[PDB]
């Protein structure tokens, strides 16, 4: 089947460049153009441009001509996008998107996307704090980390229902996130409740059991 493998999250400073990849399989690479599309968090879609891998030809949105550079390597079936002179306005998810048989046909296969954060803030591990009080709500506070993401689970996934994990918020260049879990009151604290926090950018994992005060 048609697959588009995109490179992982990038944290880059203002003024630098970033280059991301999109390796295609499951079709004839050179028979379809590769579009790129930008999506800022909680916002709409913006077309950047495309490359035709057959002949290395490009068409850009005028707003990205001079800023984004689209290339293509036939032998590795990989399309690339480079963005230069990065600002905080370039913080977004970038998708590669295979076009149809003609460059302007509606676009059918979107990659998963590459999330780019442009910031001068330093990679910083989370502090994790427990939130202890016929249901009872418990929580975890994941504070002072950068960049995104962190993952939170409870009892390594065995507690799945009654969970709210709130989107992170940026205060003074650090993210804070909380997660709640609501369990039957009779079961706590006799059955343990642990939050598992992973921050891959700082290569950190923290398990925090929630205990009564």
């Amino acid at each position: 089947q048609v697959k588009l493998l995109e490179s992982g999250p990038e944290l880059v400073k203002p003024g630098a460049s970033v280059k991301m990849s999109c390796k295609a399989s499951g079709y004839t690479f050179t028979s379809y153009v590769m579009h790129w599309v930008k999506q800022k968090p909680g916002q709409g879609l913006e077309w950047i441009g495309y490359i035709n891998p057959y002949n290395d030809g490009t068409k850009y949105n005028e707003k990205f001509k001079g800023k984004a550079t689209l290339t293509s390597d036939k032998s590795s079936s990989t399309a690339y996008m480079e963005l230069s002179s990065l600002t905080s306005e370039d913080s977004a998810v970038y998708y590669c998107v295979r076009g149809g048989y003609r460059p302007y046909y509606a676009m059918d296969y979107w990659g998963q996307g590459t999330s780019v954060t442009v910031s001068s803030a330093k990679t910083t591990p989370p502090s994790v704090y427990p939130l202890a009080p016929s249901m009872v709500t418990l929580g975890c506070l994941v504070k002072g980390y950068f960049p995104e993401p962190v993952t939170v689970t409870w009892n390594s996934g065995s507690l799945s229902s009654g969970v709210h994990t709130f989107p992170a918020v940026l205060q003074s260049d650090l993210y804070t996130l909380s997660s709640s879990v609501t369990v039957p009151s009779s079961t706590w604290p006799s059955e343990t409740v642990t939050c598992n926090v992973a921050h891959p950018a700082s290569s950190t994992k923290v398990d925090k059991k929630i205990v009564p005060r």
Partner: protein
């Protein structure tokens, strides 16, 4: 250049209901108009192209119509899987542009929040920080106001607020509000209150604790 305008920005609707969302082009695009669906956290998917042509595997309750500058997407007898965001995009040459999107959310009856308040963990207090957390869980509609008060005075500094997307099981929203203080400011006051104003009550929901209790 070419601008696409969608309406409405947001719409609430029930499973089994029929809705119409619209898309306007600033200049003639003939029937070269596509629709994409994007569910939260996921890549967009193509639903419709050439204004009225369904993409492969799209159910027949979806129907697009229109030509020239005025377009619409009708969803007959909505199903749970239809809720999410919808984007139109002309495909009359380049550059491609998208409408800003229509967010389609589930209607349910009003529900007051379940509010839990959490004093700072003794652990965090050892670090010099003191975060007071308030969860406001499983309410509807999404509009809500939270106020923190310390010994009766509203505190606006250092409040971090975050909302979940609509819960797919029960159609409600949740909110986390975190009031961040330094430890020594926290030890100067006794009464901490989180106060939620919501459509379901004339009177705010209030959760309070006293520091030395």
């Amino acid at each position: 250049e070419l601008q696409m305008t969608q309406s409405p920005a947001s719409l609430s609707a029930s499973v089994g209901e029929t809705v119409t969302i619209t898309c306007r082009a600033s200049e003639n695009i003939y029937s070269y108009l596509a629709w994409y669906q994007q569910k939260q956290g996921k890549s967009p998917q193509l639903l419709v192209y050439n204004a009225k042509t369904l993409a492969e595997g799209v159910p027949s309750r979806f129907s697009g119509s229109g030509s020239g500058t005025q377009f619409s997407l009708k969803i007959n007898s909505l199903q749970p899987e239809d809720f999410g965001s919808y984007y139109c995009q002309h495909h009359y040459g380049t550059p491609l542009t998208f409408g800003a999107g229509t967010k389609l959310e589930l209607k349910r009856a009003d529900a007051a929040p379940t509010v839990s308040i959490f004093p700072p963990s003794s652990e965090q207090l050892t670090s010099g920080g003191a975060s007071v957390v308030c969860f406001l869980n499983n309410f509807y509609p999404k509009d809500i106001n939270v106020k923190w008060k310390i010994d009766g005075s509203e505190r606006q500094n250092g409040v971090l607020n975050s909302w979940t997307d609509q819960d797919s099981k029960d159609s409600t929203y949740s909110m986390s509000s975190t009031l961040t203080l330094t430890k020594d400011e926290y030890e100067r006051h006794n009464s901490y209150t989180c106060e939620a104003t919501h459509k379901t009550s004339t009177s705010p929901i209030v959760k309070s604790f006293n520091r030395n209790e």
